[PDB]
C-alpha cells in the first residue's frame, strides 16, 4: 500500500507548503506556493481548495489531511495534468529536463543536490532518455 518512502516524500512536500513549519498549511501559504508555480488563485478560490481537503473543517491543512489527500492517487484531467506539466516544461519542448525540475524546486524553496534531481528524473523516466515527456509525466501521478 502506501510505502514508507512515499510518507517521507509527502512529508517533505508538506514542508514545502507549510512555510512557517507550524504544522498547518494556510490559504496564505497555499497562495504563495501556487503563485510561485505561476498560478494566481483568489482568496475564495484558495479557501475553496483548503476546503476540498480540510477533513476536520478547521480551515487549515494538517499532515494527516495532506497525506489523506495524496492517498487519493486513485484520480486521473488531461488539462489538469497538462498545466502541471507546463509549469515544469518551461522551454515548452515536451521534455522536462533535470535543469527545469531544479528550477521549479528552487522557486518552491527546496534545496536538492544535483544527484537528488537526477534521481527524481530517474524514477519518472521510462524510455531512459534521461528526461520526462508528457506520457511519463502522466503515469507519474495516476
Amino acid at each position: 500500500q502506501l510505502t514508507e518512502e512515499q510518507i517521507a516524500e509527502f512529508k517533505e512536500a508538506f514542508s514545502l507548503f507549510d512555510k512557517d513549519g507550524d504544522g498547518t498549511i494556510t490559504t496564505k501559504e497555499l497562495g504563495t506556493v501556487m503563485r510561485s508555480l505561476g498560478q494566481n488563485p483568489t482568496e475564495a478560490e484558495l479557501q475553496d481548495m483548503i476546503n476540498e481537503v480540510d477533513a476536520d473543517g478547521n480551515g487549515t491543512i494538517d499532515f494527516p489531511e495532506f497525506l489523506t489527500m495524496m492517498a487519493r492517487k486513485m484520480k486521473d484531467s488531461e488539462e489538469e495534468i497538462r498545466e502541471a506539466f507546463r509549469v515544469f516544461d518551461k522551454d515548452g519542448n515536451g521534455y522536462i529536463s533535470a535543469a527545469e525540475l531544479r528550477h521549479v524546486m528552487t522557486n518552491l524553496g527546496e534545496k536538492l543536490t544535483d544527484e537528488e534531481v537526477d534521481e527524481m528524473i530517474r524514477e519518472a523516466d521510462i524510455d531512459g532518455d534521461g528526461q520526462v515527456n508528457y506520457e511519463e509525466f502522466v503515469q507519474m501521478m495516476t
Binding site: T3, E5, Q6, A8, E9, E12, K73, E116, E119, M120, E123, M140, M141, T142
Partner: peptide, 6 residues
Amino acid sequence: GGKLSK
C-alpha cells in the same frame, strides 16, 4: 525524494 505512486 525517492518516489510517488505506482
